[PDB]
Design an enzyme around this catalytic site. Structure first.
Site, PDB file in Angstrom:
ATOM      1  N   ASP A 105       0.826  -1.204   0.000  1.00  0.00           N
ATOM      2  CA  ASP A 105       0.000   0.000   0.000  1.00  0.00           C
ATOM      3  C   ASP A 105       0.875   1.277   0.000  1.00  0.00           C
ATOM      4  O   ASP A 105       1.811   1.406  -0.810  1.00  0.00           O
ATOM      5  CB  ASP A 105      -1.026  -0.020   1.159  1.00  0.00           C
ATOM      6  N   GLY A 106       0.581   2.180   0.921  1.00  0.00           N
ATOM      7  CA  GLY A 106       1.276   3.448   1.024  1.00  0.00           C
ATOM      8  C   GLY A 106       2.647   3.442   1.650  1.00  0.00           C
ATOM      9  O   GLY A 106       3.084   4.518   2.054  1.00  0.00           O
ATOM     10  N   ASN A 180       2.827   8.107  -7.324  1.00  0.00           N
ATOM     11  CA  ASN A 180       1.628   7.667  -8.049  1.00  0.00           C
ATOM     12  C   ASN A 180       0.985   8.774  -8.918  1.00  0.00           C
ATOM     13  O   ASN A 180       0.932   8.625 -10.129  1.00  0.00           O
ATOM     14  CB  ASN A 180       0.586   7.092  -7.097  1.00  0.00           C
ATOM     15  CG  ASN A 180       0.934   5.820  -6.389  1.00  0.00           C
ATOM     16  OD1 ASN A 180       1.719   4.994  -6.854  1.00  0.00           O
ATOM     17  ND2 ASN A 180       0.260   5.583  -5.287  1.00  0.00           N
ATOM     18  N   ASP A 208     -15.270  15.968 -13.120  1.00  0.00           N
ATOM     19  CA  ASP A 208     -14.805  15.920 -11.739  1.00  0.00           C
ATOM     20  C   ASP A 208     -13.372  16.431 -11.583  1.00  0.00           C
ATOM     21  O   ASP A 208     -13.018  16.945 -10.521  1.00  0.00           O
ATOM     22  CB  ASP A 208     -14.962  14.520 -11.178  1.00  0.00           C
ATOM     23  CG  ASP A 208     -16.391  14.135 -10.851  1.00  0.00           C
ATOM     24  OD1 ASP A 208     -17.281  15.026 -10.897  1.00  0.00           O
ATOM     25  OD2 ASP A 208     -16.626  12.950 -10.513  1.00  0.00           O
TER      26      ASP A 208
END
Lengths: 321, 317, 327, 327
Positions: A105-106, A180, A208
């Site tokens: 993940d992060g 990212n 958006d």
């Protein structure tokens, strides 16, 4: 370089083959920064840290990691030998020789945020699922860590984007490195964000917003917005609109050497917001500009097998689930 | 060009040697033979070919172009019509006779040029008459001066794929894509995709598209792929109506080797197409190997590689 | 008429409590119990092209002895204020204040000039029964503006004096319990994340999924050409009885847009594991935070928006679709 | 209903339709069923023991069990000596040669996928009730679990089981006029043509567009989880009355999937300018060429497929959706 019987192409770049790259230590690493995903990684963390110190190396961890109630009288000896830093107060950018990530993940996003200039080599381990950024298995970690330190390990130079936010006061310029992506989205329906590519107005984004990502970020937010999965050895910058008003506005992949300039349209009624790997969200007002280019400081991800094989394995596991 | 040092103690140790945005065309010798590929185009075809011959150059065209009653009935064009150096598409190999190529009208002119040049490709100057498109940057207005300027130019080296079909081995150079589909079969396809020897997945759907950045605005666009600038080195794998909605289009490095074949469990056959042409059946044991060709198509720019594509996208949007 | 026999031995029992009595959605027409006297005029904000049509329509409606209502801000615009000729007409308008005044039971029928938010602005003013809406297009045909401004006088007269065709554009009833608040939406209710959302979606009391993504759009067939279109939804004819559930940039790519029956009850709330808060908005307006324990209940409203037809419900949409696919 | 203070819609008897509530429909046997058709998913070994178990039970309950000849030809069935007694008591039919349409009282499907498509192809008129079992995953058309099948089969036979009347499309091909019933979809594609298709789509006589792409899918709400799903369509609850039009890899990216009312008539044919031919398929079967002058007319069939429920039309689909979004 010859085109037919009479033509040819006449500025020359000197790039190493992305598939053949290997890591070199000019001096043996001494300081190691350990990053772990914010319970299954408690025993592996304790095991890794004990090993690194027994191999006569200074281990760094964020103060909050050692504050965790799970972090044990037996581990006390090691707990006292750690070098701690505070995420919002301390700069460890030039103190770290090597980075080890426990879990996915992060962890790599977090490593990237700590190193806004040159990034030390990153060795990422997976415990749960293979993921796309954690190629090493924690089984036989000691020998692997040793092979990475003593040998010439293969690497993926995961490109990053350099994001310069110029805001009118004189002028103030802020620089950010994203692993990212960089998101420019509307404020609480229709954004009016002007996208320039090498000085040319490409389009006004009405929807958006827009995601500007790296090949590493192709499996992140952009994936959900309709982008393609891009191998990290492909030199490129991806521009992905988020819920565009014009359905014909498909995701775009451009060369790594282009300069993107994003700003509010002069006719913009509402403001836009910029985010850097989902962090440091800030308002974009009239007169403010965001300039995006490929960073000269990529994140060096160490490999299990090689750049191509590792990603293919992660892709095969991704399409099996 | 990234900084090669990683922190205070590490760095990277095979070195490759031109900026895709700065590439220009150079003539070792002045061109003498031009290949022209083309109802709205009849007058500009006559105009251009009269000009090329007046500039003392041998003009090549396919025999069928001059057979057209629009060309054949014109008595005034009869002097030029006799001076053309013809060739037959399926019988004659003009690969090493042509110095430069001129395309009139959009669509499959560049596909047709690519099929004629299965080795090194001479530089292509493509003109648009109807819409701008993505591969025809030049306007026919003031063509005389533009051609003079190209002969006496900026270029994009549009990569191609080298396709090897083993069933007997057949080799094909494709500019846009190679499609592997289920054909008349109702039952979902069972196509195994290998990347550098590694089995990635079994494609179950209408099929798979394997395309070049040039082919990204073609069929793959309709199947959910991204628009990829022709300066990006890459091979693209786009599933067609996949059974698994999670199967997103894939972009891989230009140096990988793709191997496509029927799954051992495949009940029905698949079909392979090369830039929409030469459709043929893929049976059990047959393989399709795909790699980036060493012979890219050189497309001449109106302005530059980046600007030309951006305007084609500006017209697209 | 479906055949109710299934093979040689089975059938479905045709019981009175199972048979529904719905008026044909394709054959519905408008009736005035009394002649209209008050007209509400709505025009697209910051569009100069609508200024002359606005002044023309307002002059006509007053010459036809009718009280013309407008929001106070419309007359405040310097384009209207500077025009000295329009003064006589400007003084005869009934003005109301958007946020302070309730005109719900004062308006006999509504006229819209231009598309976009004109009809969703009409829906916000009428949170109960909605007066007939006659929408005009000036630029492009769109999907909610079937009338051309050419020969508007005769058309307005035909709508008042005749039995004009209508589409009963369904709306959603949205109840926010944090204290209960009720909202009527014409297009959609968006539940999105704050600066991975963890929003739970219940269908008739059954937990379907937790939405991890930008959020979820819950729309009407009218709302299918609005925000949901951009998030991957289908174009749904307004005569189709249904509720649309469209995820916004879902983490799971397999999570496709969903179309459910009009009679289902949706309950949306934060997942117990939600670290961040969610936001709810009603046709892009009245944005408000959703905290732990707060719920959003969505059902089909009993008060649909009556859209007047140029020809008929089917023909008008098909024409809008044909023009949509021509561009 | 009223619309504002003065308007309303005229409630005329010739305008009011009398439609059965799709949520309230239940099955009734005018006579007890005697002949059961058993359909099992092809090339699935996991269904062999359930098939044997089910067919032994149905025969022990004094009922004629029908199977396609090829099912009993399988070496797994042919070799089993214990199953020999039952194997000899079956009534076999040949798929493309024999018409069993008026011989079957009740259908039981083992496994999902094409089992219901196959049932639909056998019954081109009235369809007997379908009881579908799942063994692997829940799917969308197989609500029953094989656990305690004896009691469930008995409850379906002896009771008044809930039913979803899954609409079908009636397809008339004039090229000679032929009629086909489709459960999922009718596909019109470019077939082996390299060139983009040129298929004209008419809705109630109005030319909407010319499809230029791989083709067009015309589906039922049941077909929404089939081929159309892969081509970008929405998941539509089978109680939603509608016809779906989904383009396959359209040349115009703006061409979104479309959902129209169930009473519309679709006419599909080659554009006059069409250089290449198109091909029409019916639930992936009976593929045939469409030349210039040939037409395909699609309307909602009067013979829907009666799918028996485990709980009810709404509950069953929600459960299938919840399992779909869990995987």
């Amino acid at each position: 370089t010859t085109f037919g019987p009479k033509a040819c192409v006449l500025t020359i770049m000197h790039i190493q083959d992305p598939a053949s790259q290997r890591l070199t230590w000019n001096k043996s690493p001494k300081s190691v920064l350990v990053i772990k995903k914010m319970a299954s990684l408690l025993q592996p963390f304790k095991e890794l840290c004990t090993h690194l110190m027994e191999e006569n190396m200074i281990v760094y961890v964020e103060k909050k990691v050692l504050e965790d109630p799970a972090i044990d009288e037996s581990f006390g000896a090691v707990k006292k030998k750690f070098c701690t830093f505070r995420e919002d107060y301390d700069d460890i950018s030039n103190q770290i020789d090597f980075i080890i990530c426990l879990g996915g993940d992060g962890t790599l996003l977090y490593a990237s945020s700590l190193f806004q200039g040159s990034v030390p080599p990153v060795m990422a381990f997976h415990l749960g699922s293979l993921g796309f950024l954690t190629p090493f298995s924690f089984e036989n970690f000691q020998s692997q860590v040793t092979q990475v330190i003593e040998g010439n390990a293969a690497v993926v130079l995961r490109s990053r984007l350099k994001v310069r936010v110029v805001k009118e006061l004189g002028k103030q310029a802020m620089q950010y490195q994203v692993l990212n992506e960089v998101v420019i989205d509307r404020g609480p329906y229709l954004s009016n964000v002007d996208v320039y590519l090498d000085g040319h107005l490409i389009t006004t984004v009405q929807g958006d917003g827009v995601i500007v990502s790296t090949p590493t970020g192709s499996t992140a937010y952009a994936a959900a917005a309709g982008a393609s999965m891009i191998h990290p050895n492909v030199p490129a910058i991806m521009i992905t609109p988020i819920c565009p008003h014009s359905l014909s506005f498909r995701p775009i992949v451009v060369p790594a050497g282009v300069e993107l300039k994003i700003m509010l349209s002069p006719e913009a009624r509402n403001t836009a917001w910029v985010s850097f790997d989902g962090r440091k969200r800030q308002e974009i007002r009239h007169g403010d500009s965001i300039s995006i280019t490929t960073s000269c400081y990529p994140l060096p991800s160490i490999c299990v097998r090689d750049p191509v094989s590792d990603w293919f394995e992660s892709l095969a596991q991704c399409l099996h689930h």
